[PDB]
């Protein structure tokens, strides 16, 4: 199948921070999931990855040097990006995947969200 993703069309950073909320087409709750934020039209850089597994506290992280924070919420995940640089102004795309229970589930490429860091 294909999960749905609804995200804000734009987000103006306040104090070089913003809140990236991703609205999904999925679950009341409890499965093993890997949420992802990617920056760029060529979606190169993966800004953040909030991992979940039923219970076990949400494990957010970044391999790219972003001060990322993640908050769960049923059919949504919110990426709290801090210390964003003005040169990081770009289109960010949300991604969601379930790895258990099977089968593998993925999202249909969203319309994205332009983050304008002033």
């Amino acid at each position, epitope marked *: 199948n294909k999960i749905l993703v609804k995200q804000s069309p734009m987000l103006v950073a306040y104090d070089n921070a913003v809140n990236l909320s991703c609205k999904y087409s999925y679950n009341l709750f409890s499965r093993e999931f890997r949420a992802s934020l990617h920056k760029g039209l060529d979606s190169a850089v993966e800004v953040c990855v909030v991992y979940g597994n039923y219970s076990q506290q949400l494990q957010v992280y970044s*391999k790219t040097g972003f001060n990322c924070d993640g908050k769960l919420g049923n059919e949504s995940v919110t990426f709290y990006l801090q210390n964003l640089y003005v040169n990081q102004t770009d289109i960010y795309f949300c991604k969601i995947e379930v790895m258990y229970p099977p089968p593998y589930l993925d999202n249909e490429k969203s319309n994205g969200t332009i983050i304008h860091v002033k």
Partner: antibody
Amino acid sequence: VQLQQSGPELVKPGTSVRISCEASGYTFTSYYIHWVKQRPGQGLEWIGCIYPGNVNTNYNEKFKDKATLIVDTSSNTAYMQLSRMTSEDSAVYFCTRSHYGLDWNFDVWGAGTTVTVSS
Amino acid sequence: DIQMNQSPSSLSASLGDTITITCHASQNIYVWLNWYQQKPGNIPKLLIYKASNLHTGVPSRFSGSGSGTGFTLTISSLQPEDIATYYCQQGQTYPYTFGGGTKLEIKR
């Protein structure tokens, strides 16, 4: 959580052998399977990885042609194909995994498969 | 890709000695670099992941620190059982890359 690897194999210079590595003791589709080669006396280098589930794969440009990563979700087996071999292919190939969500490192290694490419 | 430059290519120390190894990275890997131990003819085992995070079961005599470009592994109170070769690997960017390894000899 064991990682069983194939026995040593002798390969005649030119041919292609496909070693294996079957997981057991955890959820196969919740981890990447990485392959790394260690030449005798030398350090070890990352060949490529594969993620059973969406069958996505990643290769190191130093092994683009030879290395072909295949997966077997039924027998929890991860295969590694080394095509067109030479005395530069002779080394011990290791099997290991990485957590899919928290992809930070390789904590479970196979015991390896020594490969000789002598005629 | 990224280059791994381990420092002591080899090193001999006595029982109880608190040695130290170094691994410099060509560019910024942040805190994504792990350390491994591989005894003679044996399989390599994870010692330290994420710069300072020890792996379950690794004694506390093993320590690790660093960020960005500089990284270091410290083993205090050496034991014969620590005779092995130590590799540094980065887990930030594909392709993953390990170091040259460092050999250790417990002097008796």
